Scaffold this active site. Structure first.
Site, PDB file in Angstrom:
ATOM      1  N   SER A 184      64.580  60.679  62.406  1.00 48.69           N
ATOM      2  CA  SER A 184      65.420  60.953  63.586  1.00 48.69           C
ATOM      3  C   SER A 184      66.891  61.201  63.203  1.00 48.69           C
ATOM      4  O   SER A 184      67.584  62.001  63.844  1.00 48.69           O
ATOM      5  CB  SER A 184      65.293  59.825  64.607  1.00 48.69           C
ATOM      6  OG  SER A 184      65.708  58.593  64.065  1.00 48.69           O
ATOM      7  N   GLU A 196      65.023  61.538  52.854  1.00 44.66           N
ATOM      8  CA  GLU A 196      64.419  60.864  54.014  1.00 44.66           C
ATOM      9  C   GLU A 196      63.149  61.555  54.475  1.00 44.66           C
ATOM     10  O   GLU A 196      62.160  60.886  54.794  1.00 44.66           O
ATOM     11  CB  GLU A 196      65.388  60.820  55.202  1.00 44.66           C
ATOM     12  CG  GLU A 196      66.480  59.794  55.038  1.00 44.66           C
ATOM     13  CD  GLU A 196      65.910  58.385  54.835  1.00 44.66           C
ATOM     14  OE1 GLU A 196      65.072  57.929  55.653  1.00 44.66           O
ATOM     15  OE2 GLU A 196      66.258  57.758  53.808  1.00 44.66           O
TER      16      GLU A 196
END
Ligand SMILES: CCCCOC(=O)c1ccc(O)cc1
Length: 185
Positions: free
Chosen positions: A88, A27
């Site tokens: 996040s 990610e």
């Protein structure tokens, strides 16, 4: 980030067999590759540290630092703390995360623990360089059984990414044993 903390496997993948653990790197790398593509030199560096953290650096423009007019905190903090699953998620599931942005002549730093900012993004010095660096320490409260990064799992995926993102240089470094690779199509 509480929805992520409540069901980490649903966002990042299996938290017991190493799937989720490695997805955390992927990610961050996705965002780093996007950043590197919008700069001139187009290189990212992925480092496995001896303390089981991973850092990902790019030489792009630096992610934006200005105050988000709606959220009232730095744009960087909004990206880190508001719900590709998004960085996040990585932040929520990291016991520590260090953010360093070099942009508009200034170095900016911020530290998070379990997704919670320890202080606002802050200017700490001057620089001629541009880029972003995220270093994260995966939470051992979330990640079980497989807790250490396997070099070849990262290498396999970065190789695939180098072909797809041709023109981007990807360096992989393992500080545990000095293993290193350079993927560049
Ligand atoms: C213009 C905003 C881009 C968003 O960038 C990120 O979320 C980011 C996260 C980790 C990185 O290593 C680089 C960028």
């Amino acid at each position: 980030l509480d929805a992520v903390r409540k069901r980490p496997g649903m966002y990042i993948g299996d938290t017991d067999d190493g799937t989720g653990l490695h997805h955390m790197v992927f990610e961050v790398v996705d965002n780093a590759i996007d950043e590197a593509l919008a700069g001139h030199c187009k290189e990212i560096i992925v480092t496995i540290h001896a303390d089981n953290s991973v850092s990902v650096q790019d030489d792009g423009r630096g992610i934006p630092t200005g105050i988000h007019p709606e959220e009232g905190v730095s744009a960087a903090e909004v990206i880190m703390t508001v719900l590709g699953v998004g960085v996040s998620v990585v932040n929520a599931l990291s016991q520590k995360l260090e953010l360093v942005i070099q942009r508009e002549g200034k170095i900016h730093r911020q530290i998070y623990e379990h997704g919670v900012p320890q202080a606002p993004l802050a200017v700490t010095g001057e620089t001629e360089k541009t880029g972003t660096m995220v270093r994260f320490w995966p939470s051992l409260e979330t990640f079980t059984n497989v807790t250490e990064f396997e070099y070849e799992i990262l290498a396999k995926r970065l190789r695939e990414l180098s072909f797809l993102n041709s023109g981007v240089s990807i360096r992989l470094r393992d500080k545990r044993d000095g293993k290193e690779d350079h993927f560049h199509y």
